[PDB]
Amino acid sequence: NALKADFESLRDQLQKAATNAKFNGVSLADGSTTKLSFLANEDGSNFTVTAQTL
Amino acid sequence: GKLQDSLDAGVGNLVDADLAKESAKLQSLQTKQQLGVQALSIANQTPQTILSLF
Questions:
Q1: If I label A40, which of B14, B21, B30, B35 is the partner at 20 to 30 A Cα–Cα?
Q2: Which superkingdom does the taxonomy of this entry point to (chain A) (predicted)?
Q3: Total beta-carbon pairs less than 8 A apart between chain A and chain B
């Protein structure tokens, strides 16, 4: 039971670390969105950055 | 402690000035300004020769 409680605590801390790590109201780790698309050209073609949910 | 200085670096990428280009442009504009003052003095001297006509 002690090892199980350690597993529960680490599993909850994993979500607490994943959800809170976000820059300027958006994140590439929490999985709230599939991708972010930053500018690459004067034309406006985006540099896609696929999100990788953690 | 990771997230705090990570966000500090993230705002630093956005707000901080590019000092090298700023120095280059600073001495560039300073050398341009004296030539602008010389062009000002020459433009003031251009009308002066009308007196020779009379």
A1: B21
A2: Bacteria
A3: 5
